[PDB]
Structures are given as structure tokens and as C-alpha cells.
Design goal:
1 helix, 4-stranded antiparallel β-sheet, mainly beta, nucleus, phosphoprotein, 5-stranded mixed β-sheet, Methylamine Dehydrogenase, Chain H, histone binding, globular, G-protein_beta_WD-40_rep
């Protein structure tokens, strides 16, 4: 159609421009086309090195989206710059592969033992694998609910405790260590309802093992306390957004600050000490927002991605500082950087935990990008 065509046209012309400015806007930009689109992406904690090599190796947990052929759980190794047949391999390879029944919606490793990877299937089961066992039939099948989902959150502080969101208006909680397994199957320690609609995302508080937050299409943010008795009584409910809320992430350097992304094209800043007053609303995205992640290195900065094909990076510290018109355009002072290297909807992204400022983002066209904005943008 005409609109599709016009759209596709602007996307290319803009991309054209982007690529030309690459050396000016970035310090690192790596593009790579997977054989299949990945809906998930998360960096693994470890870093591998060799003496004499000008690079270190990092790894990502990716997935495949084949609405046909066989799907797999992937582990990709990426070579990253250091302080400075039989030929040298490419900077990106797929070290591990694991047959997975259906697309991989999410895939997160367990903080306590990253050999453990939890998965979100297009089914209603939640799978668990140990990529030390398959070196495929999951090592654990988590019962819990009737619908598909994406929300997935491992609890630090409590080995094994996993949370999940679902299109069936509920949240499940399991103890992966679950005594017995009755045929690789662990039922569900608790099911939190309290949500009028589809639950988009879920996330554990980072310090208090009994707290966690949920987010759903009912336009609300709910804070829960595992200790409470009513599996329908969220200890708190917040009218967070105009549209449906798609995610929430806790600030790594705080025990109160939180963030949420909505279809209302907005990212809301929240403080647990007073969920009655929204601290701020980051605006600029032109379509739905599905991912929001805080920098693992700076308490003041977070990023968001969505359907508008843009990855935004914000800086709380610049909220409110005055800016010069015709500069006061392009966006508010809180918008530190805009990543326009993706040519399709960004499905998910992850901040590298060892290399401050490196981000990996997977797009729907099955493109993967490892990038780092130019130092000057966040320095001087």
C-alpha cells in the first residue's frame, strides 16, 4: 500500500543518512544479520580474554523466531575492542544452540547460576534449561497458566524464585529448586491475579526478596509483597499510564526509584516512597514502548525501545535544565542520545554489564546491533 511504501521510503533515506554519520555519532557500531529474528537479547556476566589479543569476548543470550522451521535458544559470542579455512573468525558467532519448541519470546539467565536459562514459549508453559545439560526437551516445565507471555524475572536474593507475566491476566511464581518435579514439571507456588487485563511485564525489587512489580494492559502498575496472604491484593496499585503499560525496571543504584514504559509513547519515573506523585515523564518516542532498561553503570541514565524503531537514552540529571531553542528541539534535555540504526521495530535490547555504554539491540528484520555512542555525547 501507499502508506507502507512511503514509510519504507523514509526509513531507507533516513538510514542512508544515519550510516554516513556513524563515525561522528559512535565509537563502536557492529551490525549483524541473524538467520532468524530474535525477540529477546541479554548479555551474560562473564568476559573472556587472551593475552596478546586486542579484544575480549562477551556473550549474549538470543532466540529465534521462525513461524515455520525449527527454533533455537542461542548463545552468541561477540568480540569487543580492548584498551587499544582456518582464518580468524568473525567478530560474532553462535557458540551454543538449543532446539526450542516455538519462538523464544524472552530468555533470561538465573543471576545465581547463569548456566540456568528460563524461557517464554508461545505456548503457556515456561521452560528452564541448563546449557551444561544439553552440551532438546527442557530440564523443567513450569505449569502455571493458560496463555502466552513475555514477562520474565529471576529473583536475586532468592535462588530459584522466578516470576512470569501472561496474556491470561495473571502472574505465576515458582521455586525452580522446587522439591521434586513430577516429570520435569513444577506446578506454581502462587498465582497473582489482581489484574483486569493482560500482564505485560514483571520484575523483582532488587533488594527486598519479597517485593516485585507487575505491569499490564489495565494501564496500571502494581507492587506486590510475597508475604501478603491475598494473592489478589497487590500491596499497591498505580494509575501509571494513559495506554497499556508494557514494562518496568528498577534502578540498580536505588531501593525506591522505578521506571515504566507505555503504549502512550511515554516512560514514567516512579519513587516507591510516594507512588502518588509521578516524578517525571520522558516523551519523544513516536509509538509504543516495550523495553526500558537502566544503565548498569550510571544511576542517572536509562534507555527505552519500541515500535518507532528508535532506542532512546535518557539522563535524569538533565531533567529541567534549560536549553537553547533550535536545540530545544530534537527533544528535551533529558534525551541524551537517539539510536536510529534500526530499520524495523526493536524487539529487545541489553546494556553490556562490563563495557559501560555498549548496548546490543535486536530488530524484527532479524538484525542485531552492538553499539556505543561517541564518548563526547556523555562527557566533557
Amino acid at each position: 500500500s501507499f502508506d507502507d511504501a512511503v514509510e519504507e521510503r523514509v526509513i531507507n533515506e533516513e538510514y542512508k543518512i544515519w550510516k554516513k554519520n556513524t563515525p561522528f555519532l559512535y565509537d563502536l557500531v557492529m551490525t549483524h544479520a541473524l538467520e532468524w529474528p530474535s525477540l529477546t537479547a541479554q548479555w551474560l556476566p562473564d568476559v573472556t580474554k587472551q593475552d596478546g589479543k586486542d579484544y575480549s569476548v562477551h556473550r549474549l543470550i538470543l532466540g529465534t523466531h521462525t513461524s515455520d522451521e525449527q527454533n533455537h535458544l542461542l548463545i552468541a559470542s561477540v568480540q569487543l575492542p580492548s584498551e587499544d579455512f582456518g582464518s580468524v573468525c568473525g567478530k560474532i558467532e553462535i557458540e551454543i544452540k538449543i532446539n526450542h519448541e516455538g519462538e523464544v519470546n524472552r530468555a533470561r539467565y538465573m543471576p545465581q547460576n547463569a548456566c540456568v536459562i528460563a524461557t517464554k514459549t508461545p505456548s503457556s508453559d515456561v521452560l528452564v534449561f541448563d546449557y551444561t545439560k544439553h552440551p532438546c526437551q527442557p530440564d523443567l516445565r513450569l505449569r502455571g497458566h493458560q496463555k502466552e507471555g513475555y514477562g520474565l524475572s529471576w529473583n536475586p536474593n532468592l535462588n530459584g524464585y522466578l516470576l512470569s507475566a501472561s496474556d491470561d491476566h495473571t502472574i505465576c511464581l515458582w521455586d525452580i529448586n522446587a522439591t521434586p518435579k513430577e516429570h520435569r514439571v513444577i506446578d506454581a507456588k502462587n498465582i497473582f491475579t489482581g489484574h483486569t487485563a493482560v500482564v505485560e511485564d514483571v520484575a523483582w525489587h532488587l533488594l527486598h526478596e519479597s517485593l516485585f512489580g507487575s505491569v499490564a494492559d489495565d494501564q496500571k502498575l502494581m507492587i506486590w509483597d510475597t508475604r501478603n496472604n491475598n494473592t489478589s491484593k497487590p500491596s499497591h496499585t498505580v494509575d501509571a499510564h494513559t495506554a497499556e503499560v508494557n514494562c518496568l525496571s528498577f534502578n540498580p543504584y536505588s531501593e525506591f526509584i522505578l521506571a515504566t514504559g507505555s503504549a502512550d509513547k511515554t516512560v514514567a519515573l516512579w519513587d516507591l516512597r510516594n507512588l502518588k506523585l509521578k516524578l517525571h515523564s520522558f516523551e519523544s518516542h513516536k509509538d509504543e514502548i516495550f523495553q526500558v532498561q537502566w544503565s548498569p553503570h550510571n544511576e542517572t541514565i536509562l534507555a527505552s525501545s519500541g515500535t518507532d524503531r528508535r532506542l532512546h537514552v535518557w539522563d535524569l540529571s538533565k531533567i529541567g535544565e534549560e536549553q537553547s531553542t533550535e536545540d530545544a528541539e530534537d527533544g528535551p534535555p533529558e534525551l541524551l542520545f537517539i539510536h536510529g540504526g534500526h530499520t524495523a521495530k526493536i524487539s529487545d535490547f541489553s546494556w553490556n554489564p562490563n563495557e559501560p555504554w555498549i548496548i546490543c539491540s535486536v530488530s524484527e528484520d532479524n538484525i542485531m546491533q552492538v553499539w556505543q555512542m561517541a564518548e563526547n555525547v556523555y562527557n566533557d
